[PDB]
Write an enzyme that holds these catalytic residues in place. Structure first.
Site, PDB file in Angstrom:
ATOM      1  N   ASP A   1     -46.307 -46.521-181.114  1.00  0.00           N
ATOM      2  CA  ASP A   1     -45.062 -45.958-181.626  1.00  0.00           C
ATOM      3  C   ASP A   1     -44.579 -46.721-182.865  1.00  0.00           C
ATOM      4  O   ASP A   1     -44.575 -47.957-182.884  1.00  0.00           O
ATOM      5  CB  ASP A   1     -44.012 -45.974-180.513  1.00  0.00           C
TER       6      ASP A   1
ATOM      7  N   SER B   1     -36.204 -40.742-179.191  1.00  0.00           N
ATOM      8  CA  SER B   1     -35.899 -42.077-179.736  1.00  0.00           C
ATOM      9  C   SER B   1     -34.727 -42.671-178.957  1.00  0.00           C
ATOM     10  O   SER B   1     -34.844 -42.784-177.724  1.00  0.00           O
ATOM     11  CB  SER B   1     -35.718 -41.967-181.250  1.00  0.00           C
TER      12      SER B   1
ATOM     13  N   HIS C   1     -43.821 -41.162-184.327  1.00  0.00           N
ATOM     14  CA  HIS C   1     -42.530 -41.373-183.671  1.00  0.00           C
ATOM     15  C   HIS C   1     -41.823 -40.027-183.507  1.00  0.00           C
ATOM     16  O   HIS C   1     -41.688 -39.287-184.483  1.00  0.00           O
ATOM     17  CB  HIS C   1     -41.647 -42.357-184.476  1.00  0.00           C
TER      18      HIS C   1
END
Ligand SMILES: Oc1c(C[NH+]2CCOCC2)ccc2ccccc12
Ligand SMILES: *[C@@H]1O[C@H](CO)[C@@H](O)[C@H](O)[C@H]1NC(C)=O
EC number: 3.1.1.98
Length: 339
Positions: A241, A144, A285
């Site tokens: 995503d 991330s 994610h």
């Protein structure tokens, strides 16, 4: 379990001035994986104050525990981590709220410190005295905001080690869920522009020279910064995503169907010329420190296998692919997607 070490240079700090640090598990029979945590960011006084109230471990080391369990690519068990189970393992907590770009201390004009770029540099320097001086490969990984952090910092680590006199350590990057598109929203970049000014954020020098002053925000987007990088970088990105969709204001009729199909096609296009990549057609994610990261496959090849094939390519390979991008156009058209 990885063990906490607070930085000996106490001038390199988390947002509130507490020392930053790292969690370490050494493997003396191995010649290093440094993982950057994620967790969004904050870009002005008011939203950083809100984050300090209810997300304080991402702004301070005051409440960190003494140990952390290594999971996924940070696990030392071959059953959980077929790729690098015998490596030296490092987890660098994200406590700078700046996508790992900042170089600004707390001062009488700054309520918070934003030192992400300097935290990475100082971890590397202190690790050289604990065994990193003998390394053959340093893999800088991240999920991330940490995956974007890899793109922003991998070439600076390579330059740091060269200038310090370690030209034999091969520096590489692994960017998980950090490859975003600055696309049109489904329903209605300024936050990044404002954030960079608030953090004194730094971007890689070749990318900075292309876009020039006031346009450094461009270098936070993978498809713009990746062509400027010299270190080898493997890119892991879900085609749909969840963080991308959140910013796009997506939460099915024809308009949304076409929007979602177009997003997947655009992401596929940006990876066409990225030779080391893994991009499954799933709504999800992050993945690389999840314990079940071994389950997902593209064209029959798992992510741990693809990374192993990447290692071999840096010594095409028969039966050992490194570029793996789904072509089917809808979330979960790949049966191996996370449930
Ligand atoms: O800024 C965005 C993000 C997140 N950014 C965070 C910091 O690094 C880079 C990406 C995600 C999707 C976006 C879509 C459209 C415009 C901007 C977007
Ligand atoms: C501690 O870190 C700061 C910021 O990077 C740096 O200016 C300083 O030289 C460091 N201290 C030492 C002793 O290296």
């Amino acid at each position: 379990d990885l063990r906490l070490h607070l930085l000996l240079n106490t001038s390199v700090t988390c947002n509130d001035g507490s020392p930053a640090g790292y969690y370490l598990k050494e493997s003396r029979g191995s010649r290093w994986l440094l993982f950057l945590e994620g967790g969004w960011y904050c870009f002005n006084r008011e939203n950083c104050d809100s984050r300090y109230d209810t997300m304080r471990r991402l702004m301070s080391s005051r409440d960190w525990p003494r140990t952390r369990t290594g999971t996924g690519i940070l696990s030392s068990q071959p059953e959980e981590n077929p790729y690098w189970w015998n490596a030296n393992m490092v987890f660098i907590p994200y406590c700078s709220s700046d996508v790992w770009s900042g170089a600004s201390s707390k001062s009488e004009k700054n309520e918070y410190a934003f030192m992400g770029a300097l935290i990475i540099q100082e971890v590397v320097r202190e690790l050289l005295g604990r065994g990193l001086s003998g390394a053959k490969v340093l893999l800088l990984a991240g999920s991330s905001a940490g995956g974007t952090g890899v793109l922003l910092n991998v070439d600076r680590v390579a330059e740091q080690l060269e200038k310090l006199g370690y030209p034999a350590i091969q520096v590489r990057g692994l960017a998980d869920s950090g490859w975003f598109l600055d696309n049109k929203q489904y329903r209605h970049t300024e936050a990044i522009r404002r954030g960079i000014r608030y953090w004194n954020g730094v971007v890689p020098e070749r990318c900075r020279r292309q876009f020039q002053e006031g346009e450094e925000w461009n270098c936070f987007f993978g498809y713009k910064v990746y062509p400027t990088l010299r270190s080898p970088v493997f890119v892991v990105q879900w085609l749909f995503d969840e963080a991308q969709l959140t910013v796009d204001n997506v939460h099915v009729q024809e308009g949304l169907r076409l929007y979602i199909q177009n997003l997947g096609r655009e992401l596929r296009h940006t990876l066409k010329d990225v030779p080391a990549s893994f991009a499954p057609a799933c709504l999800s994610h992050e993945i690389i420190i999840r314990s079940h990261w071994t389950d997902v496959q593209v064209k029959g090849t798992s992510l741990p296998r693809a990374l192993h094939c990447w290692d071999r390519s840096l010594h095409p390979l028969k039966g050992c692919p490194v570029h793996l991008v789904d072509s089917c156009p809808w979330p979960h058209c790949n049966p191996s997607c996370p449930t």
